[PDB]
Ligand binder design. Structure first.
Ligand SMILES: Cc1cc2nc3c(=O)[nH]c(=O)nc-3n(C[C@H](O)[C@H](O)[C@H](O)COP(=O)(O)O)c2cc1C
Ligand SMILES: Cc1cc2nc3c(=O)[nH]c(=O)nc-3n(C[C@H](O)[C@H](O)[C@H](O)COP(=O)(O)O)c2cc1C
Lengths: 374, 390
């Protein structure tokens, strides 16, 4: 079991119901998007053989919001062979099964749409005849990644206006397919140093067209994606994720003092859209400065994710803020019955980091329920 | 006495000493800038006859930070005839006396440099052959104000690049003169809807040159003033005041959800300058006002925000001002945040010994709004110090 003194959350805000988009959540413990690398290659196909049971376990407490693992909305968005896609018929046939399992449990599923940019593996992309994309040609994540891209004869490529538009069409296509197959909503991944974050952050975007050179310009791609997705599926079925203080992927974080203003701009623009009648279902923030700033800008639901499993005091406190959901990542990997365990203040299984990203049933669906653990 | 149950603050962080700029404060109760209009017209001359005593009284607790009333750095900056300036020999002679009285009391004095813009009285300016200035020709603060300007034949004038540079020169001139006359520092007024704020806020600035059209351009003037003043007198003798949620002067406040970004940007630019070796002594923020209880449910939450975001950006001292007199628990709470100073406005008008009273949890005199801006010693130097109840 994890090393903390467990405390029951059942009489806190974390266990009050809330409406998020179209869904009546019975509580506010959320499963955030978690990359697990169990999808089948080739074809980036969801591995229903193992994945259906994974999402069934974790949606077992009725009225849970589940956000899927990052899912590629197109081939060119991708680059990791064992991450699922949602653009092909054969992918969607498998997703439908997963969604059905979550719905049988009377829980909800939101698909996270994930586009890699410079975090992709350039030799895998090259094999598939695909570009190694980012905001720029020359701002590589690091010298090792640069040497990787050069060795693959797939140098980083700052995307054109036309290729930007093609991405936006791919977000749209993937969002409509997800909803058509039964998903309750989609989440636009704009965090953790992937493609849209690469535009947002000045460390990875010094473009001199309208997509770089200012806070407004750096937010433009993200906001065009939001607007296109909102138009296709409705704001009630759309969410977005940010990581203001993240440095993963060679992003700025707090080391750049202008980082908060970048996020306050983009969230303000989402707020302006909401006042005009198109309010996103929720904004998801990665916890580290602090994320307190959001509450002065966005007047909609907020999901906060990061470090809450070992800190029920801080989860309790943050949930007193208005319309705040509390996400659990690593602890949800390791605890199928996390919601129950949180509600009752039971000990939590320790996670096994060695099986986070392996192509195995082990460390995926064999973590025990509280009863089994005893 | 104010109708509240006072609580003592002397064992809180409010009464822990702190170094601001060159000055060792004994405590964190600050007198913020307070316009009182006792200056002599013509000449915008500090009224030493009364003003020396006013500032002597309120500086009596040793080691208090006093920020002066807003003070014009040149004539063209002004437009209120009973507000002081600090450009002329006559003005400076009286300021010297005022600063010496604060220093005799072992306290410190920072001159707020105040530039009016469209808040000015256009007929007052016209009589002196001065412009009625703002970011734009056409975005007036309201219809009444537009008529006032037109009847005075002094229409609003969006200032040129050369004129922006001449204002910056006047801030510099005034800062150097202020420091020469013995001021401990200066505070750039960039709040409450005055000239600099009119540039910061999109509601009053849609210029299509490098001073409008984006967060960065809207900030340009304020940051030009900061940089010029810092280079002239040093960062340790320079401060700045913002009012992110203010609507005074027909500013946006929280009703515009893009307002926080504007301020996070400017403050981040200051943090950048700090990290490179030039840290402003402090940033002064006006707190959000108490909300209108009659706002409908939705518009209540729309307007709502706090200044807590500053602590995620700026790593230096913060002065927070607004609504603390009647809420010692909140002052106590806000003072436990890093390097935080607490300002008292209306209550320092009314309580010359306000520091002592907050230290020991004594009743506070009521303020009389009728004499906030009257050219009188009455309601200026006649509020009494605490006199024991029998
Ligand atoms: C194995 C693993 C996979 C992850 N995959 C994703 C992903 O697909 N998309 C995403 O936005 N964040 C992802 N994250 C970040 C988590 O959602 C969450 O923000 C992070 O784990 C912090 O939460 P925790 O402290 O409760 O683990 C992942 C984290 C881990 C540990
Ligand atoms: C009569 C009066 C004069 C003021 N003059 C100034 C001024 O010259 N400069 C300034 O930045 N703020 C000025 N303010 C605003 C105060 O500094 C302070 O932000 C405000 O009074 C709220 O604080 P309080 O609730 O303790 O009064 C003034 C306020 C009042 C009531």
């Amino acid at each position: 079991y994890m090393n903390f003194d467990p405390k029951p959350l059942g009489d806190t805000n974390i266990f009050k119901p809330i409406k998020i988009g179209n869904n009546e959540l019975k509580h506010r413990v959320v499963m955030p998007a978690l990359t697990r690398m169990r999808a089948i290659a080739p074809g980036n196909i969801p591995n229903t053989e193992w994945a259906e049971e994974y999402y069934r376990q974790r949606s077992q407490y009725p009225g849970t919001l589940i956000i899927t693992e990052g899912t590629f909305p197109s081939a060119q968005s991708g680059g990791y062979p064992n991450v699922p896609g949602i653009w092909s018929k054969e992918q969607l046939a498998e997703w439908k099964k997963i969604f059905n399992a979550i719905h049988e449990n009377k829980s909800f599923v939101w698909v996270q749409l994930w586009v890699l940019g410079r975090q992709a593996w350039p030799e895998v992309l090259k094999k598939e005849g695909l570009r190694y994309d980012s905001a720029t040609d020359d701002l590589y994540m690091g010298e090792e990644e640069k040497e990787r891209a050069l060795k693959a004869n797939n140098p980083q490529h700052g995307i054109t206006k036309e290729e930007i538009k093609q991405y936006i069409k791919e977000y749209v296509d993937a969002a409509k397919k997800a909803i058509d197959a039964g998903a309750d909503g989609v989440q636009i991944h704009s965090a953790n140093g992937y493609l849209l974050n690469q535009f947002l952050d000045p460390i990875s975007n010094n473009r001199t067209d309208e997509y770089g050179g200012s806070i407004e310009n750096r937010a433009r791609f993200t906001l065009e994606v939001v607007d296109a997705v909102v138009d296709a599926v409705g704001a009630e079925r759309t969410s977005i994720r940010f990581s203001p203080y993240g440095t993963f992927g060679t992003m700025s974080g707090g080391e750049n003092p202008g980082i908060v203003a970048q996020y306050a701009y983009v969230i303000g623009e989402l707020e302006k859209r909401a006042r005009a009648g198109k309010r996103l279902a929720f904004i998801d923030l990665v916890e580290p400065g602090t994320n307190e700033f959001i509450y002065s800008i966005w007047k909609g639901p907020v999901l906060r994710v990061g470090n809450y499993a070992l800190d029920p005091d801080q989860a309790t406190l943050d949930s007193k803020k208005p319309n705040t959901l509390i996400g659990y990542g690593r602890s949800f990997i390791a605890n199928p019955d996390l919601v129950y365990r949180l509600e009752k203040g039971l000990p939590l299984n320790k996670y096994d980091r060695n099986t986070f990203y392996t192509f195995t049933k082990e460390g995926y669906t064999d973590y025990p329920s509280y009863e089994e653990s005893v």
